[PDB]
Design an enzyme around this catalytic site. Structure first.
Site, PDB file in Angstrom:
ATOM      1  N   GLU A  35     -19.818  -3.300 -47.522  1.00 48.24           N
ATOM      2  CA  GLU A  35     -21.056  -3.445 -46.564  1.00 48.24           C
ATOM      3  C   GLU A  35     -22.376  -3.056 -47.090  1.00 48.24           C
ATOM      4  O   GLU A  35     -23.101  -3.786 -47.106  1.00 48.24           O
ATOM      5  CB  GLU A  35     -20.819  -2.826 -45.066  1.00 48.24           C
ATOM      6  CG  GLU A  35     -19.718  -3.404 -44.274  1.00 48.24           C
ATOM      7  CD  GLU A  35     -20.072  -5.025 -43.976  1.00 48.24           C
ATOM      8  OE1 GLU A  35     -21.267  -5.028 -43.820  1.00 48.24           O
ATOM      9  OE2 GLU A  35     -19.152  -5.674 -44.084  1.00 48.24           O
ATOM     10  N   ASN A  46     -30.817 -10.041 -42.376  1.00 46.04           N
ATOM     11  CA  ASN A  46     -29.870 -10.973 -41.758  1.00 46.04           C
ATOM     12  C   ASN A  46     -30.595 -12.356 -41.449  1.00 46.04           C
ATOM     13  O   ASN A  46     -31.809 -12.343 -40.868  1.00 46.04           O
ATOM     14  CB  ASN A  46     -29.052 -10.334 -40.446  1.00 46.04           C
ATOM     15  CG  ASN A  46     -27.854 -10.425 -40.755  1.00 46.04           C
ATOM     16  OD1 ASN A  46     -27.241  -9.827 -41.644  1.00 46.04           O
ATOM     17  ND2 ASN A  46     -26.984 -10.937 -39.662  1.00 46.04           N
ATOM     18  N   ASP A  48     -30.443 -14.909 -38.928  1.00 47.68           N
ATOM     19  CA  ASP A  48     -31.064 -14.986 -37.522  1.00 47.68           C
ATOM     20  C   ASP A  48     -32.447 -14.519 -37.285  1.00 47.68           C
ATOM     21  O   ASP A  48     -33.530 -14.951 -36.758  1.00 47.68           O
ATOM     22  CB  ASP A  48     -30.154 -14.306 -36.381  1.00 47.68           C
ATOM     23  CG  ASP A  48     -29.349 -13.256 -37.062  1.00 47.68           C
ATOM     24  OD1 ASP A  48     -30.006 -12.534 -37.608  1.00 47.68           O
ATOM     25  OD2 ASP A  48     -27.988 -12.950 -37.105  1.00 47.68           O
ATOM     26  N   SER A  50     -32.063 -10.698 -37.705  1.00 46.79           N
ATOM     27  CA  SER A  50     -31.607  -9.151 -37.563  1.00 46.79           C
ATOM     28  C   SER A  50     -31.543  -8.517 -38.859  1.00 46.79           C
ATOM     29  O   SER A  50     -32.020  -9.265 -40.215  1.00 46.79           O
ATOM     30  CB  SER A  50     -30.440  -9.185 -36.932  1.00 46.79           C
ATOM     31  OG  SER A  50     -29.425 -10.087 -37.716  1.00 46.79           O
ATOM     32  N   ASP A  52     -29.086  -5.804 -41.396  1.00 49.74           N
ATOM     33  CA  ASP A  52     -27.870  -4.701 -41.520  1.00 49.74           C
ATOM     34  C   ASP A  52     -28.582  -3.356 -42.318  1.00 49.74           C
ATOM     35  O   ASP A  52     -29.115  -3.354 -43.287  1.00 49.74           O
ATOM     36  CB  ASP A  52     -26.797  -5.441 -42.455  1.00 49.74           C
ATOM     37  CG  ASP A  52     -26.200  -6.618 -41.826  1.00 49.74           C
ATOM     38  OD1 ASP A  52     -26.062  -6.468 -40.502  1.00 49.74           O
ATOM     39  OD2 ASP A  52     -26.274  -7.745 -42.440  1.00 49.74           O
ATOM     40  N   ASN A  59     -25.779  -3.863 -37.872  1.00 54.49           N
ATOM     41  CA  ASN A  59     -26.914  -4.856 -37.454  1.00 54.49           C
ATOM     42  C   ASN A  59     -27.714  -4.246 -36.356  1.00 54.49           C
ATOM     43  O   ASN A  59     -27.470  -3.486 -35.599  1.00 54.49           O
ATOM     44  CB  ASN A  59     -26.124  -5.990 -37.064  1.00 54.49           C
ATOM     45  CG  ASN A  59     -26.729  -7.518 -37.497  1.00 54.49           C
ATOM     46  OD1 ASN A  59     -26.496  -8.523 -36.827  1.00 54.49           O
ATOM     47  ND2 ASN A  59     -27.591  -7.349 -38.294  1.00 54.49           N
TER      48      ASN A  59
END
Length: 129
Positions: A35, A46, A48, A50, A52, A59
């Site tokens: 991760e 991210n 969309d 968003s 992380d 998120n």
């Protein structure tokens, strides 16, 4: 702050993460390992819109708050900057709402894809846990 594998295994195990909702501590060091690669301030944008954050890539659509995601929640009620934090307490008091919610660790895709179904124990192998 890049956590040492075991420095992390300890830390996680310190926050009663080791086996929270049946996930052997080796399941968190591994998810974290991918991760974020162990970087306490690991920020990956991210698609969309968003983001992380930190060590276990939590998120911002759902958990943390960042001010840049029109209509994304902040359940853990915290500024992701607080996730990037060197001290990973938050990220963990937070990586529980993510593993207790219902979908288990399959939330952390990198775990579901890279760890799930492997030698997780071989991730704390050296750790004086």
């Amino acid at each position: 702050k890049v956590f040492g594998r075991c420095e992390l295994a300890a830390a996680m195990k310190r926050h009663g993460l080791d086996n929270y909702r049946g996930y052997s501590l080796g399941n968190w060091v591994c998810a974290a390992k991918f991760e974020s690669n162990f970087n306490t301030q690991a920020t990956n944008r991210n698609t969309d819109g968003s983001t992380d954050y930190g060590i276990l890539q939590i998120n911002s659509r759902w958990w943390c708050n960042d001010g840049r995601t029109p209509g994304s929640r902040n359940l853990c009620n915290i500024p992701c900057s607080a996730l990037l934090s060197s001290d990973i307490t938050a990220s963990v008091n937070c990586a529980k709402k993510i593993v207790s919610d219902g979908n288990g660790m399959n939330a952390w895709v990198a775990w579901r894809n890279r760890c799930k179904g492997t030698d997780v124990q071989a991730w704390i192998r050296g750790c004086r846990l």
